[PDB]
Structure formats: C-alpha cells, structure tokens
Write a protein that binds this ligand. Structure first.
Ligand code: MG
Ligand code: MG
Ligand code: MG
Ligand code: MG
Ligand code: MG
Ligand code: MG
Ligand code: MG
Ligand code: MG
Ligand code: MG
Ligand code: MG
Ligand code: MG
Lengths: 101, 88, 123, 82
RNA sequence: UGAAAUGCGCAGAUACCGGGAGGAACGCCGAUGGCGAAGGCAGCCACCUGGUCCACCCGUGACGCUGAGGCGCGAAAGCGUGGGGAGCAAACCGGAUUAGAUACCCGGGUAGUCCACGCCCUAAACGAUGCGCGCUAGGUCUCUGGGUCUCCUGGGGGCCGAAGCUAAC
C-alpha cells in the first residue's frame, strides 16, 4: 500500500447539490478499491488556462489516499466514467522538495 | 514488487547462524527469491528483453555459488539445492 | 436591405505571411470575416505576391474596403514566419485604422507530422 | 553585441533574490508561483534565466507539465506587440 | 518557383470562426546533459522489472578475470499473416529546367513509414580504439552520492596538459 493524490476536475454549472452528489460517489468509488481518504481539499473553481470540455474554468478537488498500488489505474478509470468529471490525475505522494532563496 | 520484509524471512531461513547474512547459503536464497520474482514478471511482459538480461546474470550468478559450494562442502550442497527444490 | 452597408467599427486583422504570398484579412470582433485582399487581389502574380508590397498594398485594401463597414480600430493578428510582418501592420497604422493591439499566434507543431523534404535542418 | 558579445554574465553571484524564496518544486497545484517560471508564453524558461541547478529544473519542468494537464498553467500563450 | 507550369478554386477554394473524426509524432525543459551491453532510449501518469553509484563497515571467504563452440539481443530497409493509414514518400503519373533528362526543382502517388505476432541480422552496428585489473603530474568545466559542504573523498561525461607514447595527426 502506497499513498497517492487524486486530482479531480468537474463542471462549473453544477449546484452545491450536484457536486455534493458526485463527490459522495468519488469517495465511495475510492473505498471500493482499498482507498483510505486521508485528506481532501475543495479548492474548487479556478481560471483554467485552456478550455477543458469547452469550459474555461473548473472545480479542483484533491484527495490523498493510501491505496493498494494494483488498483490506482482502475479508479482513475471509474472516476473518468462520469460526464461531470472532466480530467483525473493520480500521482505518488512525493516528499517535499523545499527549494529557493 | 515485494522484497522489503520477506527478505529478513529468507535471510533468516538460510542464515547458517544468528546474524549470518552473506554466507553462500543465504545469497543463493535471496537471489533465487529474486529470480522466481523476475521469471514470473517475464511471463507477463515477454518483450522486456532488458530485464531478461538481468535474469541471466542472477541465473548464472546463483549457479556459480552453487558450483563453489558444491565443491567446498557437497554435504551442505545437497541440502540447500534440495531446500529450495532446485536445479537438475 | 439589398447589399446592406453594415457598420462594424471594430474587428480582426489576421495576417498570413510566408515565402510565397501575404494574405491580410478583416473580421468582426467574433472571428467572422468581412473582407480579405492579398497580393493576388492586386496585379502581382508570381513571386511578386511575396513581395513586401504584397503586405502593405493588400494591407491597405484590407483597410479601405474594411473602412467601408465602419471599422476605425482593429486588433492585428500575425501568423507565419517570412517577410511582410509589421509591414502589413504599419500599413494599417497609416491606412486610417487605429490599431488596438498587435499579437502573434504563429502555430508551431509541438513536433508532429514529418515536414516535407524541403524542410528538415537549420543549423 | 556587437562589440559587446552580450554574453558577459559574471556567474551572477548573490542572484538578486534567487527568483522568489522558499517554494517547493513538486507542487502540482501551486500555480501562483509556477506562473513565474514561464516566458511570455507557457514556454518554460532556460537555465540562463530562472536561477536553478541540475536536478532542480529536471523537477520544475516535470512539474510544469503535470500542471498543464490540470489546466492550471498554459502550454502556449499568444504574444503581444512586435 | 530562380522564374514558371501541372495542381486546387464560383458544385465558391485560400484566408478567419466554431464543431466533429482520425493517425502519427511529442514542442519549450533539453544541454556543451542523462541512462543502457550494444542496437538504442525523451509529453505526463501508475504499475510490473533490469542495471548502477554512494555511505556503513555489518555477513560469506578467493567464491575470481577472460571466454573457442553454443544460446540470446541486435538501427534502417526488406519479408509473412492481420489491422491502421493523418503526414510523409521508393516505384510510378504529370509539370519545368536541359544540347538530352527515365535527375537535381515542382504537383500528385503506391509499397513503405504504424501496431500485433512471426522472419530477416546487416551497418561509417565508429570512440573506425575487446574485457578486467594494478601503476604513472596537474589544471579546467560539468552530471550524480558522501562529506567537518563553493574545500576534500567516490562514480560518470568533456576540455587542456606531466612523464611516456606515436610514422605523424
Ligand atoms: Mg478575401
Ligand atoms: Mg530499481
Ligand atoms: Mg564473460
Ligand atoms: Mg522495420
Ligand atoms: Mg509488413
Ligand atoms: Mg491518399
Ligand atoms: Mg582500417
Ligand atoms: Mg563523511
Ligand atoms: Mg572522472
Ligand atoms: Mg591532450
Ligand atoms: Mg611531452
């Protein structure tokens, strides 16, 4: 079991009710595949530099999970089967690379 | 992927004595453990010729130890080869 | 209506320059075009269409014919690598068309499609 | 250039402020900062600029790319003037 | 295009805006860089896997180097079966230049380039310099780990050079 980070973008037209309903499903999805949501961060809505699915703005949800490697590339699939879900990108939770000054 | 803890386990099953971590006995093991691990991988992705290379070193690598051990104590030779159900 | 003298006041001015000919264009603030001229539109037939005049001169006709629909100020949009850049522009800066902005958008493939033999090396 | 060469860059030394201060290099979200490590266009700047070393840029880059896919940072933006 | 012509455009092309399908490669980073036994290898992400360098001195105890034959790997091209085929392009179709052009230039175009499995195995497959090991001034730049860290110690890449070498380079 390794940690990861799932980034997820959605539609801007959604209402607190729709989003809340999708997340609930994202979350449930994660768990169906040994995922244990450690954190989350609804930084939703930002100014995309390029229209994704023709829309110039998106919801940025970010989940950290300690999944069983063998599944990662599968969730990533089920997360991307939802219309409202525009893009998904899981990554390895890589140490800080403090750097500057 | 494994190989992080099990190791101790293999080491501890072959260490000719409390703390032995490098005797021929052990090496072979460790290396076999790796071989089996790689062999398996190689059946899935059959085109990873490179890894197929590392296979051959170890494959030869292990063999060599056995050839040394085989001449310097046939008594422990039988046992080890046999204790892994090997060669032929 | 008939042929209708439509007022636009503002729009685009796409300019395509290359080792062959220079095509200027006029459009409405929403891409839609109004009138385009070129080097071909005015006499010039051969390599004379890549002649820098091919810029201005066309880049005057684009204007003249483009001032007929109002347009007093335009947002230029350069493209391609060759000659005629800026000229087509300055051409609009004396044409009577106030120039809002000058932008470059030349499309360079992030490496896709094998170019024709004619293109391959550089240094 | 012409009689300047314009290549006279005395190993910088004490580089102004080193371009910002204390900001990770594997931040696939921290745009605010990344937006500075790109020319007028999402053109990642060279070493010549920025102010980074070996392993560093290998990362900064490996990051800016991860960013573009999230629609956070740009790949190619238009040029104003000229 | 050196000029041109074939070619494409009023069944309205080019040029601009929007949307859709598809294949292939993958900008800037990127380098005077990296990794690999060689061939060779660069969008990103995850996973499975090889090798390798360093620090610690902890374990085995000479267990080592080379390697005829054998076996496996081996750019591009080509071959077989099947798929795909955007761009490009042998052959081939025309255009033009020429004293003549089955050529350089130009407009199309098939195999091919693409993927799967199987076959071929060659190469300026070049560092044109087998592998390993020990020994013999330095300086300079650079990648990567340790360090009492802009200094010293290890691994790798370049530059200039002691002795020495070389027919010279
Ligand atoms: Mg026109
Ligand atoms: Mg590894
Ligand atoms: Mg050998
Ligand atoms: Mg081939
Ligand atoms: Mg074939
Ligand atoms: Mg065709
Ligand atoms: Mg010779
Ligand atoms: Mg130390
Ligand atoms: Mg060295
Ligand atoms: Mg020398
Ligand atoms: Mg000498």
């Amino acid at each position: 079991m390794r940690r990861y980070e799932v980034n997820i973008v959605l539609n801007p037209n959604l209402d607190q009710s729709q989003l809340a309903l999708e997340k609930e499903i994202i979350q449930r999805a994660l768990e169906n595949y040994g995922a244990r949501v450690e954190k989350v961060e609804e930084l939703g809505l930002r100014r995309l530099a390029y229209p994704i699915a023709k829309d110039p703005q998106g919801y940025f949800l970010w989940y950290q999970v300690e999944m069983p490697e063998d599944r990662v590339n599968d969730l990533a699939r089920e997360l991307r089967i939802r219309d409202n879900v525009r893009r998904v990108m899981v990554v390895k939770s890589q140490e800080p690379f403090l750097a500057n000054a | 992927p494994i190989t992080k803890e099990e190791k101790q386990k293999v080491i501890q099953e072959f260490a000719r004595f409390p703390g032995d971590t490098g005797s021929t006995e052990v090496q072979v093991a460790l290396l076999t453990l790796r071989i089996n691990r790689l062999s398996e991988h190689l059946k899935v992705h059959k085109k990873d010729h490179h890894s197929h290379r590392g296979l051959l070193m170890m494959v030869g690598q292990r063999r060599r130890l056995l050839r040394y051990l085989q001449r310097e104590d046939p008594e422990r030779y039988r046992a080890l080869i046999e204790k892994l159900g090997i060669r032929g | 209506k008939k042929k209708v003298k439509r007022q636009v006041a503002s729009g685009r001015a796409y300019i395509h320059a290359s080792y062959n000919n220079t095509i200027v264009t006029i459009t409405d603030p929403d891409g839609n075009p109004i009138t385009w001229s070129s080097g071909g539109v005015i006499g010039y037939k051969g390599s004379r269409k890549g002649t820098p005049y091919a810029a201005q001169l066309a880049a005057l006709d684009a204007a003249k014919k483009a001032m007929a629909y109002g347009m007093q100020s335009v947002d230029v949009i350069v493209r391609g690598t060759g000659a005629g850049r800026e000229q087509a522009i300055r051409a609009l800066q004396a044409s009577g068309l106030q120039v809002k902005s000058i932008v470059d958008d030349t499309p360079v493939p992030h490496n896709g499609c094998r170019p024709k033999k004619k293109f391959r090396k550089a240094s | 250039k012409p009689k300047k060469e314009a290549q006279r860059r005395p190993s910088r030394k004490a580089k102004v402020k080193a371009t910002l201060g204390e900001f990770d290099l594997r931040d696939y979200r921290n745009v605010e900062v990344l937006k500075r490590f790109l020319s007028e266009t999402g053109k990642i700047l060279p070493r010549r600029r920025t102010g980074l070393s070996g392993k560093e840029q290998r990362i900064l880059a490996k990051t800016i790319k991860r960013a573009r896919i999230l629609g956070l940072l740009p790949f190619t933006e238009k040029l104003v003037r000229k």
